[PDB]
Design a protein around this nucleic acid. Sequence first.
DNA 1: CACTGACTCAT
DNA 2: CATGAGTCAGT
Lengths: 59, 59
Amino acid sequence: KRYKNRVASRKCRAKFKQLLQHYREVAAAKSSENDRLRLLLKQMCPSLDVDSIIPRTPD
Amino acid sequence: KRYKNRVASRKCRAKFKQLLQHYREVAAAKSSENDRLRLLLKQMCPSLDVDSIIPRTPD
DNA sequence: CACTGACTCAT
DNA sequence: CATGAGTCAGT
């Protein structure tokens, strides 16, 4: 029982460690994409104040 | 030093759990913002395949 | 000396 | 079976 719990803790922690690694990457990827879409919208609509419409969020 | 480490453990787990929650929130915040940007560009430049220029990030 | 990985216990 | 917390060992 002790052995099996030792296996489950390792798994939980990695689930956890990989889960943290995953959301750290996605947060960055989504943030960079957000920057790309804001620039593309600006290129197509040079007269539109994007930052005023869809305010930026911190990171 | 059992008291000190007990405290540091809780702290390390709060950071880790906090860090994870933080990135998750940033990722979710950016995603919703990006969806609003993609819609704005569609309704501003209807005849433009944005997905072929900047595909959606696999959440 | 504080931070963190990993084992154990109790949920 | 998964996880929050105390503990020990290593960073």
